[PDB]
Amino acid sequence: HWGYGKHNGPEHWHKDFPIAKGERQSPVDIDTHTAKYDPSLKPLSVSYDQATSLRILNNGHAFNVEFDDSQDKAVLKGGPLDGTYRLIQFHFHWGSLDGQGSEHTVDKKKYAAELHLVHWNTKYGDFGKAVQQPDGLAVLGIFLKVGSAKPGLQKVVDVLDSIKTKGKSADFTNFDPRGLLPESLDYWTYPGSLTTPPLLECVTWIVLKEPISVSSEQVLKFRKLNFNGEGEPEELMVDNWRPAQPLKNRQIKASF
């Protein structure tokens, strides 16, 4: 099926997922000179104090940290959003090299990784129904650059040994996501999609201006993961990102 290889790679998604060439994909290049300062845009409201992490899973394209979204425990509001969005999972996109990995680019500049915190609009009742709405999901995008280690990310890094192959999961409780946030909540927002099939166009993207720094040895551990399941040929989990798509008249608004 779909992957990042030269045969099932992004250039091919359109064949099974026609929406691949739609009007509101995901990711895009953020042209900061053409982005519109919108003063009407409110400050983002992140309440992750009550977050309930459960587990970490290698799903064959990335590793996901799942959160209990049975109640308004970890939410997102404000910004360009109306209503409350619940956090369900976070995952990353990284590269083979430090000079690539992020999905979204800023003035053509690519970061070494990209953190996506996924939220769904509670008014729709479940994740499943939210993916059928144009205002269904809200993803908080965070760039990672190589520098100094991120204390808050180490617990994740250390468990990676346990879920090296596809389909493996490990208990992952009491993980506090507040540790992955930059200092500033300045952002860019635009109407987009999911960056992996089924590439559904129900995402409001919120890309933070300020990048978090992680160390070289932190990113290195991401790179030791496998796309494959146990007892199969080893294919290192690298370059699990989608190239920038055409903006097509959409406008990118800045909160700053």
Ligand SMILES: N[C@@H](Cc1ccccc1)C(=O)NCCOCCOCCNC(=O)c1ccc(S(N)(=O)=O)cc1
């Ligand atoms: N019920 C079917 C259709 C149907 C109906 C009747 C009979 C057969 C089929 C249906 O519509 N299923 C829709 C499923 O929608 C779920 C979307 O996929 C789930 C996993 N993908 C994600 O959750 C996901 C989340 C975030 C990102 S990202 N990268 O942009 O941050 C990328 C992906």
Ligand SMILES: [Hg+2]
């Ligand atoms: Hg949708």
Ligand SMILES: [Zn+2]
């Ligand atoms: Zn993602």
